[PDB]
Amino acid sequence: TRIHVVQGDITKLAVDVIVNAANPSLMGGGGVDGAIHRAAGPALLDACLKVRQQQGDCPTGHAVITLAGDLPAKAVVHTVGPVWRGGEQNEDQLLQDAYLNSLRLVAANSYTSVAFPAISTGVYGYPRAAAAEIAVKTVSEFITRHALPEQVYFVCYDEENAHLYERLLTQQ
C-alpha cells in the first residue's frame, strides 16, 4: 500500500521528491535526466552548479538533493547508478546505494513521497530483470524500517520495466 508502479512521465507525477538518474557531472544529459531538466527549468542546473562547486562530481552510488524548479515536486534528488560491466565490478551494490542513498536524503529532509526512475536501465545497460529486483528489494526493506517516505512510486517509461516491477511487487 506504500509502493506503487506507474507507467508514464515521471516529470508529471506530483510527489514530494523526484529522483533523477543523472551522470556524475550533474549538468544534465539525455533520457529521463534530460526530460527532468527541461521540465524543472534553468533553476535546476543552477542548483547543480552550486553543488558541483561544493562537492565536485557525483560519484556512482552517491546522491545529492536540490530544489525542483518548475517540476510538480518539492525537490529533486540526483543520483548516479552504475554502468553495467558484467556484474563483477560491484554494480549490484552500487545500484543498491543509489536507491538507498536517495531514500536516506528523502527521509533526512522529512519528505513523504518519492518517485524513482528505472536507474541504470537506460544507456547504462543494467539487465532489467536484475535491476528491478534490486530496486524493489532495496526500497521494500527500507520502508519496512522507516516511516518516511510514506509512499514510493516506481515510474517506468518502458512497459517492459513496468511489467517487471508489478510482477515483483506481487511476488512477495
UniProtKB/Swiss-Prot annotation:
Q: Which CDD domains match?
A: Macro_OAADPr_deacetylase
Pfam families tied to this protein: Macro (PF01661)
Q: Which InterPro entries match?
A: Macro_dom (IPR002589), Macro_dom-like (IPR043472), O-Ac-ADP-ribose_deAcase (IPR024900)
* Keyword annotations from UniProtKB, A to Z: Hydrolase, Stress response
Tell me the active site: 33 (proton acceptor)
Q: Give every Macro domain span.
A: 1-172
Q: Does the keyword Cell wall biogenesis/degradation apply?
A: no
**Which molecular function term from Gene Ontology is one that the record holds?**
purine nucleoside binding
Q: Which GO BP terms, alphabetically?
A: purine nucleoside metabolic process; regulation of single-species biofilm formation on inanimate substrate; response to antibiotic
Q: Does the keyword Hydrolase apply?
A: yes
This protein's assembly is summarised as: Homodimer. Interacts with RNase III. Interaction with the ribonuclease decreases homodimer formation.
Q: Which HAMAP family is this protein grouped with?
A: YmdB
Family note: Belongs to the MacroD-type family. YmdB subfamily.
Listed name of the protein: O-acetyl-ADP-ribose deacetylase
Q: Which organism is it from?
A: Escherichia coli (strain K12)
This protein's gene is called ymdB
